[PDB]
Amino acid sequence: AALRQPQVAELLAEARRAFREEFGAEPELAVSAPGRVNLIGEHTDYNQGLVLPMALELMTVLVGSPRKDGLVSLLTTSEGADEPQRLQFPLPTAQRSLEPGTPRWANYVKGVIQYYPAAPLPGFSAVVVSSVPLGGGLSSSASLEVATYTFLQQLCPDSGTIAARAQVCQQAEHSFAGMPCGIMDQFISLMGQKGHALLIDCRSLETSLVPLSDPKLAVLITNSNVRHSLASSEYPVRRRQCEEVARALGAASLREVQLEELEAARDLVSKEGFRRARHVVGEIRRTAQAAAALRRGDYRAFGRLMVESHRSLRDDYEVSCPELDQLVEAALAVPGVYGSRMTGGGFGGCTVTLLEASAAPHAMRHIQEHYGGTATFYLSQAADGAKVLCL
Ligand SMILES: O=C1CCCC2=C1C1(CCCCC1)N=C(Nc1nc3ccccc3o1)N2
Ligand SMILES: OC[C@H]1O[C@@H](O)[C@H](O)[C@@H](O)[C@H]1O
Numbered sequence: 001a002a003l004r005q006p007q008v009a010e011l012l013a014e015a016r017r018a019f020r021e022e023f024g025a026e027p028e029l030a031v032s033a034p035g036r037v038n039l040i041g042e043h044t045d046y047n048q049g050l051v052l053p054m055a056l057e058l059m060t061v062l063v064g065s066p067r068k069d070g071l072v073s074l075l076t077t078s079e080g081a082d083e084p085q086r087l088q089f090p091l092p093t094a095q096r097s098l099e100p101g102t103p104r105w106a107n108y109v110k111g112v113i114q115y116y117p118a119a120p121l122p123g124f125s126a127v128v129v130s131s132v133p134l135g136g137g138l139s140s141s142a143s144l145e146v147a148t149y150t151f152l153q154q155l156c157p158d159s160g161t162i163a164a165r166a167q168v169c170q171q172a173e174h175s176f177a178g179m180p181c182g183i184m185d186q187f188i189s190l191m192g193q194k195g196h197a198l199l200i201d202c203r204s205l206e207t208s209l210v211p212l213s214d215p216k217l218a219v220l221i222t223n224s225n226v227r228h229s230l231a232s233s234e235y236p237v238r239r240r241q242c243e244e245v246a247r248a249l250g251a252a253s254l255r256e257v258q259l260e261e262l263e264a265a266r267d268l269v270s271k272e273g274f275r276r277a278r279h280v281v282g283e284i285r286r287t288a289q290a291a292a293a294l295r296r297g298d299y300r301a302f303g304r305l306m307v308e309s310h311r312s313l314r315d316d317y318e319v320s321c322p323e324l325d326q327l328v329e330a331a332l333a334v335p336g337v338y339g340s341r342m343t344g345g346g347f348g349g350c351t352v353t354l355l356e357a358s359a360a361p362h363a364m365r366h367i368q369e370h371y372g373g374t375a376t377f378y379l380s381q382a383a384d385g386a387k388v389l390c391l
Pocket of ligand 1: 060076078080081082104105128129130134135136140141142144
């Protein structure tokens, strides 16, 4: 069966009670930011490509109050978070900046604080809760970054765009978590809307809300519950390989490159380099094609495109793994399934499946039975982005 997904009210209540017991007073502020699944458009965001994620009902919630002593005091109740579950530190200054360290979960909060553009930022007390599986492939860290950003805005309103907010959270990921992500994760956490996926053009930063609310249609997320170390170390390698190919062809990015141009300049790049670029160029196309298909309500074409995306990721970009592949192959054997593919960075994490709603229970049974391991399932509607509630 699919794991329960606590409503924001439940996570709010848990966070509020925790805060009350922890700090001896009621919290004054509450925010939430969702994790996400990427329907299609993988390893294209840092290539100034197209991506089509949707926000999940899985989310991170922060409750808290401003302090008058310029200190930051944190507590998380998430099991899976590394010890200690509490941390305190003074606000950064011009002379002293925050630094990444232990516990790692606090690095995301520290990073957002460090690069928060508006001032004066006061200190604060906060409790962090989440229903997003920590490092499970659904951007738990993006949701924490965006939840944190959304909280800091209540303490000290910025005056910029939503893209600038995503880039701040992205810089936190780069500099405090050592993960040089693209913009997708933060952007969808910020900009998600219930009942819609979000087509993001990562070159222009133009975004389009694409309706995705059809009873009869379901999105099944399957967690492999594995994560090879390559997910961390091979990710930056992929970025460098794409940059090298773009540089060899005199292109600002692979978004400017088409398959024909790529093959014509085959002698100018490495064998594997060609494989990487071919995926990227094809995946941008497929995402454009997927967006249109989803518009038409053509789930069969959308599904077929998801499958091409996985095969490309598996064979050209080489960021899949036997676990993900077995999960995909299993799902495609189930009647009523339109398509299935690995989602997110790869080397573990989740797959995403588009299927007839009625097929979801039978999909879960069969996928689990064919998965030589322990799969976890989520059935998720397209959810809202970051929100605020005054307490
Ligand atoms: O293992 C690393 C590397 C792989 C990516 C992954 C991290 C960990 C680092 C800290 C310990 C758990 C795993 N954190 C998540 N993100 C996260 N989101 C959170 C929301 C609320 C509370 C805590 C949270 O941690 N991402
Ligand atoms: O599509 C692959 C994705 O991998 C994620 O892990 C990363 O945070 C995103 O920015 C995007 O690059």
